């Protein structure tokens, strides 16, 4: 929402500064006045006001502990409840006005850090930051060791944010964290992994706990790196653009402990590729216990990639075998019909998947005729009151 709106329009700025003295002081006046008055703003602007409020509080998480925030909030409500329910103390009653200045003073009294740079970055400079963190490959049996360049410039609505950290996951190893600097034409290192050689013997040297994964299917000649990440706890208002090997993106979608990483790899593999191994790994990801909406966007991956299977129709007409192999009512003799509920995984999945099935098109007349007849047969096969769950949205998304 924030990246979409502040690339549509300008930023959503949180003023302490007035335009007093008939002054404007408004680079955020691409449309309207914002400083002193509510009833000029738009609901897009108001919604992104609340959204940036969410993510500025997450920045306060990222610099200040949650227990200290509980201390701050208990102090605020202590002053509020003490200042309330009394005989109206004259000249000593406006302590319930707990606005930005005194709240900042209370935070600095609890823990005084560089939160005024956090204000002058995100409260007082309304900008969405993209990230052109250009992947370079050192220790590809190279002289230099595991180096990645940092770059950013994209005007119109840009912002230059400096000292942060970068998260790299190895093949089977440590969460490498690397500092950042301002003056963003930069080159930086990684706190290097060992030379993971004889990896047929080095099967699982503790990837992330006791996770079990084995693939030499990647470009694993001289590659100790798997994935790039900048603040996986989602601090910075970000739009990160980079490139990896495609095997690294597809190996992210077999398992990764971030739904963020899963759906961003889902978007990045919705853009370009069409191998059949992508379809296979997508179908493997869709048949486990991982997440609900990851599989919605993975069926949209199947849709976009099978739309690119016009001249490259290697696999079957997709997503029929996914309804076959995952749903057994009474072993389902070629058709899944009745009472597939009380497991909301299957509820959301059967709600989503035929919409992505209707997108499966190869260009002759786009010909989804088998899919059309299959959706007609699914619309035939609805349930009685054995499902106690009011079969309404399933019908609605099949009509969609």
């Amino acid at each position: 929402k924030i990246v979409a709106y502040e690339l549509k329009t300008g930023g959503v700025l949180l003023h302490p500064i007035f335009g007093g003295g008939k002054e404007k002081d408004n680079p955020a006046s691409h449309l309207h006045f914002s400083i002193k008055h509510p009833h000029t703003l738009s609901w897009e602007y108001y919604s992104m006001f609340q959204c940036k409020a969410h993510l500025v509080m997450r920045l306060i998480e990222n610099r200040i502990s949650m227990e200290f925030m509980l201390q701050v909030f208990n102090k605020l409500l202590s002053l509020a409840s003490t200042a309330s329910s009394q005989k109206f103390q004259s000249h000593m009653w406006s302590q319930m006005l707990v606005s930005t200045s005194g709240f900042l003073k209370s935070i600095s009294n609890v823990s005084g850090k560089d939160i005024q740079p956090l204000i002058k970055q995100w409260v007082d400079q309304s900008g969405v930051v993209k990230f052109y963190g250009s992947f370079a490959f050192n220790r590809k049996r190279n002289v230099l060791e595991l180096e990645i360049k940092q770059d950013y410039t994209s005007p119109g609505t840009q912002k230059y944010v400096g000292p942060l950290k970068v998260t790299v996951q190895e093949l089977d190893g440590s969460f490498n964290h690397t500092l950042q600097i301002e003056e963003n034409s930069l080159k930086h290192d990684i706190p290097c992994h060992s030379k993971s050689r004889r990896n047929k013997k080095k099967k699982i040297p503790l990837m992330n706990g006791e996770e079990v994964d084995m693939d030499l299917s990647a470009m694993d000649a001289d590659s100790p790196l798997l994935w790039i990440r900048i603040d996986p706890d989602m601090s910075v208002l970000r739009k990160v653009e980079f490139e990896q090997a495609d095997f690294m993106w597809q190996y992210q979608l077999r398992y990764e402990r971030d739904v963020v990483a899963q759906q961003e790899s889902i978007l990045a593999l919705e853009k370009f590729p069409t191998p059949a191994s992508r379809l296979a790994l997508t179908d493997i990801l869709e048949q486990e216990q991982c997440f609900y909406r990851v599989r919605m966007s993975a069926c949209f991956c199947l849709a976009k990639i099978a739309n690119s299977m016009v001249s490259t129709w290697t696999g079957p007409p997709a997503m029929k075998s996914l309804f076959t192999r995952m749903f057994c009512c009474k072993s389902c003799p070629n058709i899944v019909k009745t009472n597939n509920f009380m497991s909301f995984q299957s509820y959301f999945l059967q709600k989503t998947m035929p919409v992505a099935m209707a997108l499966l098109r190869d260009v002759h007349n786009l010909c989804p005729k088998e899919v059309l007849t299959f959706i007609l047969d699914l619309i035939k096969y609805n349930d009685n009151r054995k499902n106690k769950f009011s079969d309404n949205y399933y019908r609605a998304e099949m009509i969609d």
Partner: protein, 52 residues
């Protein structure tokens, strides 16, 4: 045995699960389209083309 002994008659087995539920869903579709046509031609009507 054609004259002395006898037997017993049932004369009705089909036992086809998928065919039975196809018949049930087809009858449900028939009831849907029948009531659709009934109150389609009965009450206040606006069409998709001109005079459907």
């Amino acid at each position: 045995x054609x004259x002395x002994x006898x037997x017993x008659x049932x004369x009705x087995x089909x036992x086809x699960y998928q065919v039975l539920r196809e018949k049930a869903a087809s009858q449900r579709r028939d009831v849907e389209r029948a009531l659709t046509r009934f109150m389609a031609k009965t009450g206040e009507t606006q069409s998709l083309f001109k005079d459907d």
